[PDB]
């Protein structure tokens, strides 16, 4: 009714996850395996310096502005058997985008100023290892307005259109270069979003832009 503490995990072996479950059980702690607004805390497997790989849950918890923390929180909490403070075991960074980019931290604070605010996005098919609808959710949670087809781009002039795709995901079709024809709006890779999100700050479209053909 007022406050709750649900959880998910990610990057965990089955094996490890059981000692999680155990703890959760112990401390009257909710735990789901599928993630939502309801989720508050998000546990990740890390290195000693709280650096982790980039799983889908990783990305989403940050976007949500959720408490992203290391498994070592638990192992320690277990060691003491005692509810240790989460804050300390917050994630500093990840493998790709720096071991201490403080992104999740930044997410938590920078809520008033959601990175993709003002932006219309058509997560244009196709993709892998995260379905569009998820990707779509991700950006909504970073302020983005979301579009379902190319035509449907609201036009003019405050609003910014942008197109995202996962090109390698295109079976026998180098067709992503034509999109420049389908609409004049920018075409960028997923990478942009992910990295934008990983740091919680909207990135330069340049690096991630995608050649087009007229």
């Amino acid at each position: 009714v007022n406050k709750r503490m649900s959880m998910v995990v990610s990057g965990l072996t089955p094996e490890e996850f059981m000692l999680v479950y155990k703890f959760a059980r112990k401390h009257h702690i909710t735990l789901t395996n599928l993630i939502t607004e309801e989720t508050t805390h998000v546990v990740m497997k890390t290195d000693a310096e709280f650096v982790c790989e980039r799983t889908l849950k990783y990305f989403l918890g940050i976007a949500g502005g959720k408490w992203v923390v290391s498994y070592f929180w638990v192992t320690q909490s277990i060691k003491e058997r005692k509810m240790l403070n989460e804050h300390d075991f917050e994630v500093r960074g990840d493998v790709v985008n720096g071991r201490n980019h403080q992104g999740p931290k930044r997410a938590r604070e920078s809520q008033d100023r959601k990175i993709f605010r003002g932006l219309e996005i058509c997560c244009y098919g196709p993709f892998t290892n995260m379905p569009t609808d998820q990707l779509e959710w991700m950006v909504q949670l970073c302020g983005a307005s979301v579009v379902k087809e190319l035509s449907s781009f609201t036009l003019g002039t405050g609003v910014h259109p942008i197109v995202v795709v996962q090109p390698d995901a295109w079976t026998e079709d180098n067709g992503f270069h034509a999109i420049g024809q389908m609409c004049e709006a920018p075409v960028v890779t997923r990478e942009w979003v992910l990295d934008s999100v990983a740091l919680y700050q909207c990135q330069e479209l340049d690096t991630y832009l995608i050649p087009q053909i007229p």
Binding site: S10, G11, E53, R54, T55, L56, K57, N129
Partner: peptide, 9 residues
């Protein structure tokens, strides 16, 4: 299949 792993990026 007793599997299986979380995807990375």
């Amino acid at each position: 299949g007793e599997y299986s792993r979380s995807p990375t990026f």
